[PDB]
Write a protein that holds these residues in place. Sequence first.
Motif, PDB file in Angstrom:
ATOM      1  N   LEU A  32       0.929  -1.131   0.007  1.00 37.81           N
ATOM      2  CA  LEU A  32       0.004   0.120  -0.023  1.00 37.81           C
ATOM      3  C   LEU A  32       0.725   1.348  -0.033  1.00 37.81           C
ATOM      4  O   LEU A  32       1.661   1.618   1.085  1.00 37.81           O
ATOM      5  CB  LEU A  32      -1.111   0.170   1.254  1.00 37.81           C
ATOM      6  N   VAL A  33       0.933   1.968  -1.073  1.00 32.02           N
ATOM      7  CA  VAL A  33       1.566   3.132  -1.180  1.00 32.02           C
ATOM      8  C   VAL A  33       0.749   4.510  -1.291  1.00 32.02           C
ATOM      9  O   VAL A  33      -0.377   4.080  -1.467  1.00 32.02           O
ATOM     10  CB  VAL A  33       2.559   3.230  -2.480  1.00 32.02           C
ATOM     11  N   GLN A  34       1.305   5.627  -0.922  1.00 33.07           N
ATOM     12  CA  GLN A  34       0.635   6.783  -0.621  1.00 33.07           C
ATOM     13  C   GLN A  34       0.911   7.657  -1.899  1.00 33.07           C
ATOM     14  O   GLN A  34       2.057   8.284  -1.923  1.00 33.07           O
ATOM     15  CB  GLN A  34       0.824   7.602   0.787  1.00 33.07           C
ATOM     16  N   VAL A  35       0.129   7.880  -2.789  1.00 30.04           N
ATOM     17  CA  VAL A  35       0.150   8.835  -3.986  1.00 30.04           C
ATOM     18  C   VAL A  35       0.245  10.291  -3.640  1.00 30.04           C
ATOM     19  O   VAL A  35       1.058  10.970  -4.068  1.00 30.04           O
ATOM     20  CB  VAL A  35      -0.667   8.272  -5.258  1.00 30.04           C
ATOM     21  N   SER A  36      -1.050  10.598  -3.001  1.00 29.84           N
ATOM     22  CA  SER A  36      -1.409  11.899  -2.700  1.00 29.84           C
ATOM     23  C   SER A  36      -1.837  12.228  -1.298  1.00 29.84           C
ATOM     24  O   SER A  36      -1.935  10.863  -0.658  1.00 29.84           O
ATOM     25  CB  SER A  36      -2.318  12.451  -3.504  1.00 29.84           C
TER      26      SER A  36
END
Length: 126
Positions: A32-36
Motif C-alpha cells: 500500500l503506497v501513498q500517491v497523494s
Amino acid sequence: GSSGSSGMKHSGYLWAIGKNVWKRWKKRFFVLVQVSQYTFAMCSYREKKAEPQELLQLDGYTVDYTDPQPGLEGGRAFFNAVKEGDTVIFASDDEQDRILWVQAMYRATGQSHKPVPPTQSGPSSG
C-alpha cells in the motif's frame, strides 16, 4: 504540482483479482503506497528491485468485509473494494490481517460507509 511523497503502510503477499489487473487469482506481493495526501494505490512489486507490474489506485475504491465469493480459493479472510465501474476482491491468510488491511485501505480511499469487524466466531459448513 510537486513530485509527491512515497510511503508504506502495510506490505505482504495477498490474493486479489481484478478486471484490468491481476486478472488471475493468485498470491502475489502487495504494498500500500501513498500517491497523494489523500490518495493511495496498490503496487504489486513482483520483480527484484524493479518497477511494479500491476497497480490499482485506491482513489474511491470502497473496501469492506464481504462473504467468501464462490471460486476464489486462496486465503481465508475475504474483502473486496467497490468502484464506480470496477470491482476487485482481496484475501489474506488470517482474519486478523484482513482487519489491519481494511482499516488502512478504508482511510486510503475515504469511503462514506466505514468498515466494521463482524462477530462470526466460526460456524461449520454442511
